[PDB]
Amino acid sequence: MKINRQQYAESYGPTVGDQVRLADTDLWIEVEKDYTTYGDEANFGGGKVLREGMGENGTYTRTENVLDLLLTNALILDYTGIYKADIGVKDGYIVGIGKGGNPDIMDGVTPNMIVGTATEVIAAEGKIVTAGGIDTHVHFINPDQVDVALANGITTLFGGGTGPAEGSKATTVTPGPWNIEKMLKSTEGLPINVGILGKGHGSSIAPIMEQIDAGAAGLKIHEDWGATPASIDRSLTVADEADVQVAIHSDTLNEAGFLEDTLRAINGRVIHSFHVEGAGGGHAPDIMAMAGHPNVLPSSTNPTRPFTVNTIDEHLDMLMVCHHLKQNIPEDVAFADSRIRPETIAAEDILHDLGIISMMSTDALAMGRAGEMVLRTWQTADKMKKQRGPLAEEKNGSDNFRAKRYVSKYTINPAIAQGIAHEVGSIEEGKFADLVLWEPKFFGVKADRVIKGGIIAYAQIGDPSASIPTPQPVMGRRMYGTVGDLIHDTNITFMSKSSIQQGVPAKLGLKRRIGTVKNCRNIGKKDMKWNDVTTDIDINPETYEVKVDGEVLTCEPVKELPMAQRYFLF
Amino acid sequence: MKINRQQYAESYGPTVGDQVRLADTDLWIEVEKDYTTYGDEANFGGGKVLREGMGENGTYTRTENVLDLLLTNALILDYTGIYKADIGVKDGYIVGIGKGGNPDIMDGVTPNMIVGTATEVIAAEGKIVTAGGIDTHVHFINPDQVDVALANGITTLFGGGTGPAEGSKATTVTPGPWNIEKMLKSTEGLPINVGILGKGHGSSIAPIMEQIDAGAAGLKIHEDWGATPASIDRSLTVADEADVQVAIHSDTLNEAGFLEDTLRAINGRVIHSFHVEGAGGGHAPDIMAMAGHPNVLPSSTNPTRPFTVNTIDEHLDMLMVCHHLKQNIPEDVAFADSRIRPETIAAEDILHDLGIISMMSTDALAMGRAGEMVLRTWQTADKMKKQRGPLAEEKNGSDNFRAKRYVSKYTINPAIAQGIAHEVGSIEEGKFADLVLWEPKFFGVKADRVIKGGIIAYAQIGDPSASIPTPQPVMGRRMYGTVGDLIHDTNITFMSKSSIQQGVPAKLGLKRRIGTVKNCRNIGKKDMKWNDVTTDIDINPETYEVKVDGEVLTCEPVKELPMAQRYFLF
Amino acid sequence: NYIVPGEYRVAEGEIEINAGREKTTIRVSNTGDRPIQVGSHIHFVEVNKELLFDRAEGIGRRLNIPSGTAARFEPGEEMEVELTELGGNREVFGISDLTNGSVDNKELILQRAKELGYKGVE
Amino acid sequence: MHLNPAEKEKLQIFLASELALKRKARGLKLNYPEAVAIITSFIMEGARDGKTVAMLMEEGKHVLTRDDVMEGVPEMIDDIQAEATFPDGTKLVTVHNPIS
Amino acid sequence: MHLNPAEKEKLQIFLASELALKRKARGLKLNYPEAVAIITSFIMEGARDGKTVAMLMEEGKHVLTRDDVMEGVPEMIDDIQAEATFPDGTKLVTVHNPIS
Amino acid sequence: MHLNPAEKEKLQIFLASELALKRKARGLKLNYPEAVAIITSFIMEGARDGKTVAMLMEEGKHVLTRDDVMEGVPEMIDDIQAEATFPDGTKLVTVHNPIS
Ligand code: NI
Ligand code: NI
Ligand code: NI
C-alpha cells in the first residue's frame, strides 16, 4: 500500500524532498533526510501507535533506554541540517535524535529512544522545531521583557543590568560583586536561561576580576563607561585568565583612538563585537570593518535588520531624542549623521548574507527589540533572496543553504561566542532540551510551544476555562515549567569557572541549574558555523561606502516586509 | 566660563537659591545648599564624566571606598533639609550624601563616594528624591494593595490583617501566634517592608504577650475588639516590657469611658493615636484632643485629608453603609452625626499646618486609600498655604518650612513612632536605601522609580517590547528587585526584640532582612520632627468647635484640589 | 499665574565652572580623516594620537567646558580649545596608559606619548 | 500615561459598560454584571465631568429601570460603589438600590 | 489570535484613547493621560494604515491643540513615543511637543 | 460585577473586535488577529443574543469574506473556537473555514 505525498505530509509532517514555506516569506526549506521507517511512524492519540504492547514498550523501567519525552515527527531546522526525526529527551537533555517507539515490534528504533511507561509525548508532525534562540545583547531593564523574548522563541538571555537605572539603560553591565550577587538572586525568578556580564572597565586587574569571581559570566566594554585602550586591555587580560567572553561597544567618538587603536589594544585576543554595523554604537564611521578580522566574533543588533524605508528616519530621531541632542546644534547633527548611515546599514544586509557577520542579537530595551531577534533574522534572509537571488551554493530550488546560514546567527553562533555551546544553541544529542515548536505559518513570528529543560515553559494557548485549550483568546502564556520550584530545574544560570569553584551558588542559595562558561578564548571567526568569512572590509571615510574584494556593497531599502502586518494586532 | 542658571538647572538639576514647583500646587521648594563642585558634577552617558580614568576611578576594588550605586545630582526633600547632593549606596544602605566621582582628578569628592568598576548609576538630575513613605495604618486585606502603595512612593507597611476576613477588614490586627506566623510567611512574597501588629486586647498579660514573642512588631487596640480600660492597660504594660508601639482606635461609643477615661488608662505611657480627628474612629466627639498631649504620637488617616466639598457627604454615606446603619433609625443617624463632623475635619487641616498632628497614614482598605498618603499630604499643605498664607517661619518666598513639616508626616515621624527610624524614614547616612525619585511635574502623584534596599523595585516605564523603555504604555511595573530571591534582600520584615532573640525567623524560614523594633517607649510628641507641638485642645461638646489658645480653628472646604484631575485617568 | 507643573524658578546669576583653576588656550588639529569628539574630563594629553597639538600643554589638564559636554573636531579641522587644571590628587590611571601616576611626571608622560606616536611631542 | 494599578483596572469597567450598552442597544434585557458595569461607569464618568457625590447618588438610581434588566437583577443589586477622581480628589460614591 | 505580550498591552492604549475621545466629545478639556492616550493611539493606527514614520512625526503635532486640554498639559508633554508594526516592520515614532 | 478569570479575559476579545471593526470601516484589508477577533466576538455576542450553536456554526462562515482580509488570511484560519454562556449554559462553538 502507498500513500500520496500530500496526504503523507498532512498526517506525519513532510518527508524527503518536500518543501515548506517559512511563514509568508519567499523562503523554502527542504527535508534533506528522514530517520523514520515508513509505516512505523510514531504518533499519539485514540487508536494511535504509542500504546502499550504496540509503539509503547510495556516492559522497561525508565532507566532502561526509555525517554521522559518524545517529540514525534519533528522537522528540525538547525545548523546541523534540515531533516525529519523524532527527538528524545531525558533528564532535561536531548539524548536521542532518530526514531522513537518500541523495538518489540517496530523496525529502525534508535536504541535509547524507547517510548515506555515514563514517556510524555509532544506531537511535532507539521511543526518546525529549532533550538531556543540565544540573545547575547540583553539589557536587564524591565522584567516584562522575558515573556516578550519567550514569545519569539528566545530561551537564553546574556547581558547585564539592574533594572531601569541609567547605567543599565545604556550598557549591558551588572557592575561589581554586590550588583552581580543581587541579580543572580533575581535570576532565580526569571523563566529563561541567564548569564550576567560585569563592567569591562578599569586600569587595575582586581576591580574587574572580582566581578568574575562574584559570578559574572563575561564582561562588557562600553563607551559610556570609557571604551579606552586601558579598559579594553585589562578586560581582555581578565577574560584570558578567567575563560569568559568580552563584548565591546567601542569609542564612537574616536576620543582616545580610531578603530585601528581599538584593534591594537585588543592585540589579536578574542572579542565579541556588538552591533558591529555601528548604528547601535562604535567608531564612526568604520566600526563594521571589525567583522573582517579573524579574532572578532561579530554580531548585529536588530533595529537595523533589515534595511527598510522607515529605518533611517526612525534611527536619526531615536539617536537624537535618546542622547538629548538638539536639531539646532550642528555638533549634535554632525554626530547623528556620522553614526546613522544608509551606506553601512545596506552593506550590513549583504554582510549577513555573505556569512561575514556571524550573529544576531536584540539590544533589548536600549536600542533593540527583545522579541524580534528571530523575526528580523528571517526578514533579512527574505530580503536578500529577493534582491541578490538564490545563493550559488543552493540546490533543488530550496533555500536550505541560506536557512542554515541564518538560523546559525541566533542559535549556535552566540552560544559558541559566549562559551556555552556545550549546553545550548543547537538540536544535538547531549545538549539541554531548549526546543521551540513553530507552526510553519507562524515560523519566526510567534512560537507555538517553548520547551525549557524538557518541560514546556511558554505556549500560545487559549481560554483556561474552556472544555479544550484552543478556544479564544489564544495568547502567549507561562506554563508549568515556570511555576513553583520547577523554574529552578528548567533554566540555567551561566557562571564563570572561578565563581563556581568558589561556591557562589551555595553562598547565594541559587537553586537553578548552574552552567559553566568555558572555551571562550581559543575560538575565532573560523568557529562561527556557516558564517566564517574573514576579509578586508573597507569603509570610505568620506562617502561611507563599504567595499569587500574591490566591490561596493549596496542594496535598496524595502517598503514592505513579510512577518509584519499580516500577523500583528499593533 | 559661566553657564546661565536656566541652562545649568536643565543640565544638572537646580542649584542654590533655585526653586521648583511641587506638581501643580502653589508650593515651591528652594535648594538650600549644594554639595557639588561647579564643573565637576557627576553624570553618566556617552562622552560624559563617569568614565574610567575620568570621573570613574579605575584603580579601587569595591571594598576600597567604592559605591554599589550613585544617584547623581539629587534634589533631596527630607526633614533634614532641602538640598542638592549625590547619594551613594552600598550593601543596600545609604553610605554617603555629598559629592561622588574620582579623587584622582576631581575636587571635593566625599571620600567614601568613589565611582569605581563596581558602581551602578542612576541619574537624579531634575528629579526630587525623598525617603520612601512609612504607612503605619495598613489593613492587610488584598495583596493588590502593595503596588498601589509603591506607585505613590510608599515603601513600608505597618499594620495587620489576614486578608478580607471581617476582623482584618475592620482592624489592623493579625491575631495570635498562628495568624502572625502565617502572615510573616506571606510577607516573604510582598515587595515592600512590613511590620505586623497583634491584637491589643485581653485582661491577662500572657495572651497579648505571646503575639510579640511570635513575631508581632507592635499592637493595635481597636474598639471593635473592646477598647476598654483593661485592654488599653494590658497592651501598654506589654509594650513597655517588649519595647514596641501600641496604636489605638478608641471607644467611639464612650461605652466604658470618655476620652479622659482612655487617657487615665494610658496613664502617661507612650501611644500612637490613629485617625486622631475621629472620622476614622474614636471617642465622639472629642478624640482629637489626644493630639495635645505629650505622651501621644498623633496620626491622621487620609480620607479627611484635606477638607473638601465632597468630604462630608462621602463620609456620612460611607459610615452608614459600612456599619449597615439605616437612615430611618434615629440612633444610627445620631451616631453618624456625632462621628462625621465638619468642625473637626476643618480643624484637622489647621492642626496639621501648626505641627500639632505629627503623622499621615492611609487606613488602606478599611477607611483610607493605600496609594494616597503622600498625595493628600501635599494637597493639605497646598490648601493651607492658600487659606492661611506662607507660615511666619518661611523666608525667600519659598515653602521650605512647610515642605519639611509636611514631608516629616509620612517619612521620619511614623518611623520614629514605630521604633524603626534607625533603619528607615529619612535620607541619612547609615539608613536603608529606600529612595523615591519623582519628576517634579508628578511630585507626590506618581513615583518615577522606587528603590528598595539599593535596587529599583517599582518604576513607571513603557513597552517591554520596544527599542527603548519610554514608548507607550508607560505604567507602574514591578522591577528586578521584586523578582526571585532578590525580594528577600531588598525588603525588611520588622519584628520585636523577643521574637528575634527566640529565633522566629529561623523557625519560620524567613529569608527577608530582619529589622529590630526598638526605642518606642521613651519618646513623646517632642520627638516628632517639625511637628512637636503640645497644647490644650478644646472640643466643644455641643457645637464641636475646636479651640487652641483661645482661638476657634476653622477653615472652608475647597471645591478643587491640585494633584487630581490633571493626572488621573479615572 | 499660568501653572506649569514642576516648573523651575531659577535664581539670578551665572555659575562659574572650574573657578580658581588656571586656564590655557591651545590650538588642536584633527589630522585624521574621521571625526574626533573629546569629553570634558579626559586627561587632555591622552586623546587620540591623530590630534596634533603641543602634548606637553595637555598634561595635568582637561577641557574647560561644562561637565558632561564634549568638543568636536571634524576631519582636518583645527581650532582653539580652552583647558583647565585637573583637581583632586592630580593623578591619572588608565585611559591611554600614558600617566598611571602623578601628572607631575612630564618627562615620562611625553616619552611614552612619543614612543606610541601621539602627535605633537616637542 | 503613567497608569497606576487602579487606572489600569478601571479601564475594564468602562469596557464592560461599552459592551453592556451595545447589548442593551440591540434590545437585550441586561444581566447582573452588565447592569453593574453600566451604572459603575456612569458614576466614574460623572466624577470626570465634575458632578458632586450627592448628584451621582441621585442620578445613579435612574440609569437603568427594572424593564432594562432580567428578572431578579434589581433585587440582586443592593448598592453599587465606585471611587473616582472628582475635581476635589478621589471620593467614594455609593448608589443604594440603583434599580427599583 | 496568538497575542504576544505587547499586543495585549497595546489594546489598553486603544481603550484609553476611546475613553478620552468620548470625554472630549462631551466637551471636557482633556487631562495628561487622556491626551497621551489619544495621540499614542493615533500613531499606532497611522502605522496600521501604512503611513510613514515621517508622516506620523508631522501629523502627531496636530491631533490636539492647547484648547483641547487642561492648563499645563501642553507643557507636561515633551514627547510621546510609540512602536507599531508598519508595512516594513516595527518602528519607533517620537512626536516632539505634540501640543503647542 | 464578580468577574471570574474568563470574563476578564474575554473582554479583550470584544476590545480587539472593536479595534478591527474600526480598521475595516476605514477601508483596510484585515490581518490574521483582526479577522479572528471579529469572528470570535461575533460568536460570543451571538450566544448572548440566545442563538443556538448550530446557528453560529452557520453564521460564522459569513461574517468576513476573502475580500475583507489580506492575502493568505483565509488559508491561515482553519477554524475559530469560542466558549460563551448560552441560555442553556456554556457551550463550545467551532466555526470551520470561516473565510472561503
Ligand atoms: Ni551598545
Ligand atoms: Ni546595548
Ligand atoms: Ni480605626
Ligand code: NI
Ligand atoms: Ni484602620
Ligand SMILES: [O-]
Ligand atoms: O548597545
Ligand SMILES: [O-]
Ligand atoms: O481605622
